[PDB]
Amino acid sequence: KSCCSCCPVGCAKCAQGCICKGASDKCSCCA
Ligand SMILES: [Cd+2]
Ligand SMILES: [Cd+2]
Ligand SMILES: [Cd+2]
Ligand SMILES: [Cd+2]
């Protein structure tokens, strides 16, 4: 399933959950 509508998939920065706080269209924690 999609972790966030900003990251693709299998994002290590979203593997242990969702450490993405940046945004939805563009973040800066999974650049
Ligand atoms: Cd994201
Ligand atoms: Cd991510
Ligand atoms: Cd996420
Ligand atoms: Cd991020």
- Backbone gaps in the chain, preceding residues (C–N over 2.5 A): none
Quote the CA–CA distance of 15 and 13 in Å, as a whole number. 6
Residue bearing tokens 């959950």: 17
| Technique of determination | NMR
Distance from the CA of 4 to the center of ligand 3, in angstroms?
4
Residue bearing tokens 């920065």: 13
Residue 9 — left, alpha, or beta (φ > 0 → left; ψ -120 to 50 → alpha)? Answer: beta
Distance from the CA of 18 to the center of ligand 3, in angstroms?
4
Distance from the CA of 1 to the center of ligand 3, in angstroms?
10
What is the chain's Cα-based Rg? 8
The burial of 22, by beta-carbon neighbours within 10 Å (0-12 exposed, 13-18 middle, 19 or more buried), is given as middle
The distance of Cα 20 from the centroid of its chain, to the nearest Å, equals 5
Quote the CA–CA distance of 31 and 1 in Å, as a whole number. 20
Residue bearing tokens 């999609």: 2
Ion ligand 2 neighbours (CB, 5 A) are 7, 11, 13-14, 20, 30
Query: CA angle at residue 29 from 24 to 30, to 5 degrees?
Result: 80
Residue 18 tokens read as 């969702």
What is the signed CA dihedral for 10, 6, 27, 21, rounded to 10 degrees? -80
